[PDB]
Design an enzyme around this catalytic site. Structure first.
Site, PDB file in Angstrom:
ATOM      1  N   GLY A  14       0.901  -1.317   0.065  1.00  0.00           N
ATOM      2  CA  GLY A  14       0.018  -0.096   0.080  1.00  0.00           C
ATOM      3  C   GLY A  14       0.763   1.267   0.003  1.00  0.00           C
ATOM      4  CG  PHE A  18       0.637   5.870   5.483  1.00  0.00           C
ATOM      5  CD1 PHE A  18       1.241   4.736   4.962  1.00  0.00           C
ATOM      6  CD2 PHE A  18      -0.817   5.848   5.130  1.00  0.00           C
ATOM      7  CE1 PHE A  18       0.799   3.772   4.190  1.00  0.00           C
ATOM      8  CE2 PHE A  18      -1.237   4.803   4.143  1.00  0.00           C
ATOM      9  CZ  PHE A  18      -0.630   4.001   3.697  1.00  0.00           C
ATOM     10  CG  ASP A  97      -8.304  -1.991   5.026  1.00  0.00           C
ATOM     11  OD1 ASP A  97      -7.803  -0.934   4.419  1.00  0.00           O
ATOM     12  OD2 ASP A  97      -9.305  -2.592   4.690  1.00  0.00           O
ATOM     13  CG  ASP A 136      -5.310   8.651  10.963  1.00  0.00           C
ATOM     14  OD1 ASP A 136      -6.328   9.201  10.474  1.00  0.00           O
ATOM     15  OD2 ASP A 136      -4.626   8.110   9.929  1.00  0.00           O
TER      16      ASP A 136
END
Length: 277
Positions: A14, A18, A97, A136
């Site tokens: 991914g 970030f 996820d 977050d």
């Protein structure tokens, strides 16, 4: 010792604001790992290691919460390069996820939402105890270990050391920030965290986030698009209180009647994960 001489870099997993993470395998025990890269320029917050060492705030927070508890991903090791840092994180399998799980299965049954929500509450709690404030919490930052039925908090790239005084900075997810942030650009860790928990919970039982615009967040009116029990609705409305002071504490959330009789991680997987449905 370099890095490649220890791990076998794999394809891309991914990537976002970030970093860029790749699949990896540790040479010596073929232990599944995730290799996260971060450019020193993209880094905004820095910190000192327990031995005084200029490093990314992410590394600082990760090492403080990295122990035995499997509620948060573990930082196995990190390396430094001239323009970036590399983080070796544990990587369970199979894994998906919360966001894809929700997108795929839609609104979750309350029994499953209770187990999941309970597990993230324990993980966030773990962090706070270690002096770490995530900032977050959202479906995208929570992994599901499909076999164990255990959730894992990830990406501390927007975290910070936990403090009892106000925070004037925030680089987390807007739609998850509290009305204090939007309206005054200031907040307190724990109460702001409870707000994002309420958003998350709602996201779990409704299949989608409850607010999209700042005015919706500021108004705080919560409309349910899916059938939700009165107890769960009340917990959500409570976490989503406009005034921080009116939000429940983590203790109050876990003592709330909707939160009772949670399923054990393994029972959850056996009942909701080990199946085609």
């Amino acid at each position: 010792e370099p890095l490649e001489s220890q791990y076998q870099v794999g394809p891309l997993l991914g990537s976002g604001g970030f970093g860029s993470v790749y699949s990896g395998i540790r040479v010596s025990d073929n232990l599944p790992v995730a290799i996260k890269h971060v450019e020193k320029d993209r880094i905004s917050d820095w910190g000192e290691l327990p031995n005084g060492t200029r490093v990314p705030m992410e590394v600082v927070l990760l090492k403080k919460v990295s122990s035995g508890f499997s509620g948060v991903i573990r930082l196995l090791d990190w390396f430094e390069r001239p323009d970036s840092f590399v983080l070796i994180l544990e990587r369970p399998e199979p894994v998906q996820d919360l966001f894809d799980f929700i997108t795929e299965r839609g609104a979750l049954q309350e029994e499953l939402a209770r187990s999941f929500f309970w597990q993230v509450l324990e993980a966030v709690r773990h962090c706070h105890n270690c002096g770490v404030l995530h900032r977050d919490i959202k479906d995208e930052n929570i992994l599901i270990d499909l076999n164990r039925g255990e959730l894992k908090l990830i990406d501390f790239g927007s975290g910070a050391l936990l403090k009892d005084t106000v925070y004037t900075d925030f680089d987390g997810t807007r739609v998850y920030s509290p009305p204090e942030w939007i309206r005054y650009h200031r907040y307190h860790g724990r109460s702001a965290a409870v707000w994002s928990l309420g958003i998350l919970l709602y996201d779990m039982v409704c299949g989608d986030i409850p607010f999209e615009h700042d005015e919706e967040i500021i108004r705080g009116q919560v409309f349910f698009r899916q059938r939700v029990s009165s107890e769960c609705q009340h917990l959500i409305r409570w976490c989503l209180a406009l005034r921080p002071s009116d939000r429940p504490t983590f203790e109050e959330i876990q003592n709330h009647p909707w939160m009772q009789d949670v399923l054990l991680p393994q029972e959850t997987a056996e009942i909701h994960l080990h199946s085609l449905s």
